[PDB]
Design a protein around this ligand. Structure first.
Ligand SMILES: *C/C=C1/C(=C/c2[nH]c(/C=C3[NH+]=C(/C=C4\NC(=O)C(C=C)=C4C)C(C)=C\3CCC(=O)O)c(CCC(=O)O)c2C)NC(=O)[C@H]1C
Ligand SMILES: *C/C=C1/C(=C/c2[nH]c(/C=C3[NH+]=C(/C=C4\NC(=O)C(C=C)=C4C)C(C)=C\3CCC(=O)O)c(CCC(=O)O)c2C)NC(=O)[C@H]1C
Lengths: 313, 315
């Protein structure tokens, strides 16, 4: 099973109970964005991140009464149609708001049962993706495909280190390709224990295909209330990219000298084949539109891995 | 019966009938569609060899001036990028794309690929979260039918085409329309089946490697290359990989007779085989700009993946 989260007086996580930390329900988010939850029917704002006032420019109480209808007039009917009752928690809808306080915000919404989860992040506003797609497809074998993928991602993102991280049948990880800035340790060829990404983390990565710690030293921002009014239970935040990252993991990242981390899942035959794994030495918020490019690349790599593995077997 | 290609018309080959169909060399027509321009150049020196006859009007230069310069001089910023992206021996399927600001012609999209020692350069005029939203909707579709319907509707919304079908090949290469989105008033092709020779076997081979072809105007005359043969080889210039390639007069006749002014289709390739097509129709001529066509190319790949996934959920 899972332990209760901390804020419901559950045990603190150690190396004896990695497998049981409830990472989907931390009750908090990373501070480079803001999150609101809301009722599926009424559009009634039920929870907000204590930092919402910053991003939205709204007097705190104003929000926690109001309706999405009021708050987002153009958007609220689109949401209603895009995310019908009963849809999967994996389905997401995005829009760009030109919002008074903040030039442009990206809005990302998904639905978990009766709750809409809304994420707001700063945003903005060429051929590198098309060029990359053809490059991946003409790679002659899996090894070269891995090399092209890591190089392409590094060029698109500027990340200090991009790795392709392949799982063995027992969930032992091996770095099979790597693109990195001069003057970093090489992780190419190295193998790591399964428990570095515990089973409850791998399952969640099979369904929700991208996550990140924008700053390995930033404090999480609580949800208020912490419990969903609807259920008097924790809000599931696994489908939210803003979810506060595990302190266990952030301790690991910090011990490696990483300041910013991001990964993308490569899913083949319904199973987690590997990850595109990015490190930056310093804090780094990759903007939403560039993340989208990596999300596309994730799908394309999933296709090409199967194609390429089929021409060996 | 499968038989080798006839020589093209310009090398004294025969004209094509319902009989010899499968031997038309549709990859070497010696000509392009008039809404863009094409140059060929030597892959090592960058000497310009062939150009479409309309090139002066896209590129704003006399032929003899174009042909008298190397790509190093014509494309000083792109020439080194081309050479890195398209190394000798690379496959003909690999494409490099850039946007140019050309004085006389505005923003041009440049698409380049390499066939042996030849570079082929295509120039076309070029111009929010719809793709991301579509990607997730496709993935959440519960079964093959719902996927097919979401895919057709999405493509129609992105493009404005009068008719978008999902055509699926059977094992005998006979095809069948399994989903479609269509303009009000058009009659339904859903569930109809069509014989295998409607897409003869050489076209289906070409459609497995080069994943998007089109006919922007089913009545437009083709524009010859000049000279027609590659001076490197005194042989035909391979245009399979060029979207500007001229369509077979057989297929343009099959289209006009249906009332179609514009045709476009994207291959859906599963396990190395052509599974089916995203085929689109418009009643009037219609040019879809290169950046919009890129969205369809990306959807072609997504759909190939999702078709595998939906079919595996099915035994
Ligand atoms: C108690 C158990 C421990 C534990 C927990 C834990 N680990 C993750 C997530 C990740 N761990 C990763 C491991 C590596 N990244 C690398 O680059 C290398 C090698 C150089 C390794 C071994 C990765 C990639 C992830 C995914 C997240 C990311 O991309 O940064 C989680 C889940 C994190 C979250 O979703 O919040 C958890 C709970 N880690 C341990 O090391 C043990 C002691
Ligand atoms: C003697 C040869 C004939 C022939 C040849 C031919 N066909 C193509 C390409 C296509 N034919 C298609 C057929 C259909 N389109 C539809 O909308 C329907 C049903 C409603 C059918 C059956 C399609 C979709 C294509 C793909 C091209 C496109 O999408 O426009 C070629 C190749 C043309 C080229 O690539 O240059 C050729 C040579 N078709 C016949 O019917 C016979 C008479």
């Amino acid at each position: 099973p899972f332990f209760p989260p901390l804020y419901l007086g559950g045990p603190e996580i150690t190396t004896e109970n990695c497998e049981r930390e409830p990472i989907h329900i931390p009750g908090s988010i990373q501070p480079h964005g803001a999150l609101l939850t809301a009722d599926g029917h009424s559009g009634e704002v039920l929870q907000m991140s204590l930092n919402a006032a910053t991003f939205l420019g709204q007097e705190p109480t104003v929000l926690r009464g109001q309706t999405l209808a009021a708050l987002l007039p153009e958007q609220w009917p689109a949401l209603q149609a895009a995310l019908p009752p009963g849809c999967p928690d994996a389905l997401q809808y995005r829009a760009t708001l030109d919002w008074p306080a903040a030039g442009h915000l990206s809005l990302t919404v998904h639905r978990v049962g009766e709750l809409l989860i809304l994420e707001f992040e700063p945003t903005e506003a060429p051929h590198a993706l098309r060029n990359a797609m053809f490059a991946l497809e003409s790679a002659p074998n899996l090894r070269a495909l891995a090399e092209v993928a890591t190089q392409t991602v590094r060029e698109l993102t500027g990340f200090d280190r991009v790795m392709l991280y392949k799982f063995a049948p027992d969930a032992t990880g091996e770095v099979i390709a790597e693109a990195r800035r001069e003057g970093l340790h090489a992780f190419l060829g190295h193998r790591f224990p399964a428990s570095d990404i515990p089973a409850q983390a791998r399952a969640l990565y099979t369904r929700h295909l991208l996550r990140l710690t924008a700053d390995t030293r930033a404090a999480a921002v609580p949800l208020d209330p912490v419990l969903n009014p609807q259920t008097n239970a924790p809000t599931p935040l696994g489908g939210a990219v803003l979810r506060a990252t595990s302190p266990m993991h952030m301790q690991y990242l910090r011990n490696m000298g990483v300041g910013s981390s991001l990964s993308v899942s490569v899913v083949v035959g319904g199973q987690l084949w590997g990850l595109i794994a990015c490190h930056h030495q310093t804090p780094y918020v990759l903007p939403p539109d560039l993340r989208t490019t990596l999300e596309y690349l994730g799908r394309l790599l999933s296709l090409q891995v199967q194609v390429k593995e089929a021409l060996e077997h």
